[PDB]
Design a protein around this ligand. Structure first.
Ligand SMILES: Cc1noc(C)c1-c1cc(O)cc([C@H](O)c2ccccc2)c1
Length: 127
């Protein structure tokens, strides 16, 4: 079956603003995760056709990935840090839901998530 359209990264009817926390999420958080050796499966949407996973989009109803997050940060899609953090969390949770504990893909997601949480603990104050 065909892949769904990817999550939107532009919508003029969505409100948005720049905040120092959103700048940090791009310049520090995304940047650090993007270059991790285990980033590559998370850098674009799951292509279930390419991966031959007929069931993926029956199980994962709210797909998210770092390619989408990157474009949302770069294109000023977000209103606040919480919206972006939620996208990261959806990405990690989808991987844990779809796959099994201890699978390679899960260990990769877990390594990224550990870093992610280190980085979010250093989220600057809104200023
Ligand atoms: C990410 C992710 N969450 O569920 C799936 C499936 C993926 C996923 C996304 C991809 O681009 C590639 C793969 C691939 O099968 C794999 C990569 C590394 C180690 C083990 C396997 C899985």
């Amino acid at each position: 079956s065909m892949n769904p359209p990817p999550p939107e990264t532009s919508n003029p009817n969505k409100p948005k603003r720049q905040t120092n926390q959103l700048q940090y999420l791009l310049r520090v958080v995304l940047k650090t995760l993007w270059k991790h050796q285990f980033a590559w499966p998370f850098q674009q949407p799951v292509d279930a056709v390419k991966l031959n996973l007929p069931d993926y989009y029956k199980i994962i109803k709210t797909p998210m990935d770092m390619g989408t997050i990157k474009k949302r940060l770069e294109n000023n899609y977000y209103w606040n840090a919480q919206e972006c953090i939620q996208d990261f969390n959806t990405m990690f949770t989808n991987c844990y839901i779809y796959n099994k504990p201890g699978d390679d893909i899960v260990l990769m997601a877990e390594a990224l998530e550990k870093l992610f949480l280190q980085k979010i603990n250093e989220l600057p104050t809104e200023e």
